[PDB]
């Protein structure tokens, strides 16, 4: 009962490339890229934010272009609702290793009884905030990989490309009995993160750019990172990454001319970029989590006192891009004692035990938006404590506030 994701790359790409959507909701921080590296895409990358506003990125590369769709419908229907339970257990339980294996276990048990035909390699990272500082923790099994760039010009390597002596440990039925072995040889992590750190996820690279980090044995495995020596500290990682692969691609195809006729190599190249958000962006993300979830519920119940909410849906659909007004509109709906069913139904749709606990949640996120430097510019020496109550009175006029409201969206 929610919509969280922001940008996705599904089983599709345009001619030779597919870039992005640059979702406003991420304020220019959600970008991905996809290309073919030999005609169709098999990989899938997902970047989004929790209902509590925590950042995450999922990277998938499939095996067979024949199934290629239940792999995706597996992620969209069952894996996505698991992210909230991941970041929460990361916040509640300190032990990063325990829940991650259970998550993989829950993934394996779920992938068996719902779509065991799916064989892919997946990697993911999710952010969580237990203390004042931000933490991110995830794993990755297969030919995939995640990298990070910090605030100092360091390309630190998160989840690595695991190679089992020339075997790609993956989410296949074949490994579904050697599960516990897959974890000890694959990469799981939990690392401290600061705002502005650049999270980069990738699927395939020509091996000329990969450098071997770790080799060991179990009763041989290669844990290998992305070589940072050919990268700079001034430019972002994602934009710099494509500057070299195309530069090496033309160098690789030129190598492919001197061999009679066509040679064969290359995989689906899909790359995702994520930037860790600030404490301000989280709140207005936490704001957007409610605005999306509140609308759709009572629209099918009544479909089988509605005239307001249909106009309310359009009203939020007009001012959802500004996170401040989108908040205060909600405060009026709960205060309307003449719309109790429309008020009381939402918490049931949202699983809230008490309406009042929600009403506290409104004000807490409301007042912190005053710490956003944009509202101090718009709200100056105006005893805001009363104005919200005034604004609460303003919205109850159901029957031309937009110009009066346009005072607060003047950016």
Residue numbers in the entry: 37 to 74, 88 to 268, 279 to 363, 383 to 477, 484 to 495
Quote the passages of the study that discuss this structure, keeping the authors' original sentences.
Crystals that diffracted to 3.6 Å were obtained with a slightly truncated variant comprised of residues 37–507 (SidD37-507). Residues 85–88, 269–276, 365–382 and 495–507 were not well-defined in the electron density map and could not be modeled. The six SidD37-507 molecules present in the asymmetric unit displayed identical structures with an L-like shape formed by two domains in nearly perpendicular orientation. The N-terminal deAMPylase domain possesses a protein phosphatase fold, while the CTD is formed by a bundle of anti-parallel alpha-helices with no apparent similarity to known structures. The two domains are connected via a flexible linker and are positioned almost perpendicular to each other in the crystal lattice. The ab initio molecular envelope calculated from the SAXS data revealed a similar L-shaped structure but with a maximum diameter Dmax of 115 Å, which differed from the calculated value of 89.2 Å for the crystal structure. Indeed, the SidD37-507 crystallographic structure exhibited a low fit with the observed solution scattering curve (χ2 = 2.48) supporting the hypothesis of interdomain flexibility. Our SAXS analyses subsequently revealed a relative mobility between the two domains, with 76% of the particles existing as L-shaped molecules in solution while the other 24% of the particles assumed a more extended morphology. Upon closer examination of the CTD sequence, we noticed a stretch of hydrophobic residues between helices α7 and α8 (370-FLGIYGFFT-378; loopCTD) that was unstructured in the crystal structure of SidD37-507, indicative of intrinsic flexibility, and that could constitute a potential membrane anchor for SidD. Having a high degree of flexibility between the catalytic domain and the localization domain could increase the sampling radius of membrane bound SidD from a two-dimensional plane to a three-dimensional space.
